[PDB]
Design a protein around this ligand. Structure first.
Ligand SMILES: CCc1oc2ccccc2c1C(=O)c1cc(Br)c(O)c(Br)c1
Length: 517
């Protein structure tokens, strides 16, 4: 098997460290790409465009000066939920509301009119956003979630198209192409003049994100020992956790959505540049039937590891003899039908995927709309990343010490309970709300590594990959379904959070059924 070749060549040497660092670095920026939506697509307060305020001629026509606060009351109906109406304007100016008495029900909807001239957004915190540019407000409010869904749709498509491709052309080639596609698509989306064009380039960016993620995952775990695999994943996950901290650093500097996207998607040009000086997986070359390339790559890895003589001793005969087990009897991937045929495994599978979905649905429903969780988004963005790392290390320590099943159940249950508690406390006590939201997101980050490590060992080795793929697809499908739930928020902001908090609790409670180890 290739394990003998890896042992002969290395496994935990200089080359592994260098390649791991190089592959880990881009995941921060990949996280930034996904988490862009919070700052690029922020929704500011949108008053209606009123002639008597913006047009200076009309305002100056009246003798004397009238305060903006008092002048607004004559041309904007008092809106629902304690604010000036964000989608209606008075048909004619009304001075009754001004001087003597205040009309609660008199400012009825009969005299109102839709925003014919457009809206006037607030630029105090964000210079520009996608919502302001294309007026994704009032009747078009549903467009913002949909767009997000479309982005998360691309992730579902990319993994469905970059998987069979990576097994035909090679992992590193597809990874390089994905870096280039990311850079180009981001730069194009920065300049999108129309809304469908921006959505299309966002879909392409999601495609490239999926390709990069899967190729990196396959590359790191094919050049390292099987004993270090549990550790490797964490190094990848922790890298993503740093993106949060980076995002808040970038968003706090540039407040224009176009410049934000351009800054985010530029480094991937450098990533594509240095992608050339990387290592193609020797396992794929050897099993596919390309022995010259595999031998040269293995000798290169041996030279980097510092053992030139050992690398030189390798010959085609030894390589063929060592790899006969995998090549002589080709292990074709066990069909999903075969995995679902066995009565014994069914209970294990149905629960397992149920966890994946529960994580994917709940995370992307809460992460992308971070405004509802707290008061300001910069502090929440920083704190999510700051708290994920201790959580993601404590989960590994508990898995080593405590059983996997209790940890898997507890993480999901606590995350769901934290979200449920967060949605109940009054908005006045912002500190409690923010802390509970941060802790829930941290618990979800913990559950990610817990389930990723655990699901591998549940099923036999023959059908393990099929089960992992099924779980990953379930996570992506729940991710697509996540944002659409926010449309229910019209009935009230509490319902989406109630759903997002209820799903993880049930998933965690069900996770107790599946066996330990
Ligand atoms: C469903 C698979 C998927 O595709 C993405 C594309 C961009 C950003 C995140 C993801 C993502 C995740 O769910 C995810 C969540 C956490 Br937490 C991680 O630490 C890592 Br690594 C990945």
């Amino acid at each position: 098997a290739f394990s003998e070749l890896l042992d002969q060549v290395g496994g935990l040497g200089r080359f592994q460290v260098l390649q791991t660092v190089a592959l880990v670095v881009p995941i921060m920026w990949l996280c930034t790409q996904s988490m862009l939506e919070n700052f690029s697509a922020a929704v500011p307060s949108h008053r209606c465009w009123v002639p008597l305020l913006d047009n200076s001629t009309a305002q100056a026509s009246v003798p004397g000066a009238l305060g903006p606060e008092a002048l607004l009351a004559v041309s904007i109906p008092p809106g629902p939920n304690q604010g000036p109406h964000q989608c209606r304007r008075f048909r004619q100016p009304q001075w009754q509301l001004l001087d003597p008495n205040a009309t609660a029900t008199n400012w009825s909807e009969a005299a109102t009119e839709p925003c014919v001239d457009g809206w006037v957004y607030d630029r105090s915190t964000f210079t520009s956003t996608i919502v302001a540019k294309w007026d994704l407000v009032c009747d078009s409010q549903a467009l913002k979630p949909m767009a997000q869904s479309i982005y998360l749709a691309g992730i579902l498509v990319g993994a469905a198209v970059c998987g069979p491709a990576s097994d035909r052309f090679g992992r590193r080639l597809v990874l390089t192409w994905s870096y280039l596609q990311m850079a180009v698509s981001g730069t194009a989306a920065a300049f999108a003049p129309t809304f469908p064009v921006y959505c299309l380039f966002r879909f392409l960016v999601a495609f490239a994100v999926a390709g990069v993620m899967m190729n990196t995952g396959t590359l790191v775990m094919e050049w390292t020992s099987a004993q270090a695999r549990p550790l490797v994943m964490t190094l990848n996950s922790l890298g993503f956790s740093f993106g949060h901290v980076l995002m808040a650093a970038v968003a706090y500097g540039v407040r224009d959505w176009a410049l934000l996207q351009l800054v985010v998607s530029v480094p991937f040009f450098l990533c594509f540049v240095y992608s050339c000086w990387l290592a193609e997986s020797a396992r794929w070359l050897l099993i596919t039937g390309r022995l010259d390339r595999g031998l040269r790559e293995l000798q290169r890895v041996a030279a980097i590891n510092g053992k030139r003589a050992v690398g030189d001793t390798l010959t085609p005969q030894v390589l063929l003899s060592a790899m006969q087990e995998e090549l002589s009897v080709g292990q074709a991937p066990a069909s999903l039908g075969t995995l679902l045929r066995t009565p014994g495994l069914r209970l294990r599978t149905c629960i397992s995927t149920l966890c994946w979905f529960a994580f994917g649905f709940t995370f992307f429903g809460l992460a992308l709309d971070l405004q509802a969780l707290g008061s300001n988004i910069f502090l929440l963005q920083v704190l999510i990343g700051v708290v994920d790392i201790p959580a993601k290390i404590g989960t590994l320590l508990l898995l080593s010490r405590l059983g996997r099943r209790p940890t898997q159940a507890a993480s999901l249950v606590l995350a769901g309970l934290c979200i449920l508690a967060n949605t109940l406390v009054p908005h006045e006590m912002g500190a409690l709300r923010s802390a509970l939201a941060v802790l829930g997101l941290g618990g979800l980050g913990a559950a990610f590594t817990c389930i990723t490590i655990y699901s591998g060992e549940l099923f036999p080795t023959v059908l393990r990959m099929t089960a992992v793929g099924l779980g990953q697809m379930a996570a992506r499908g729940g991710a697509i379904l996540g944002p659409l739930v926010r449309l229910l928020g019209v009935h009230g902001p509490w319902l989406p959070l109630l759903v997002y908090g209820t799903v993880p609790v049930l998933s965690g409670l069900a996770a107790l059924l599946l066996p330990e180890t």
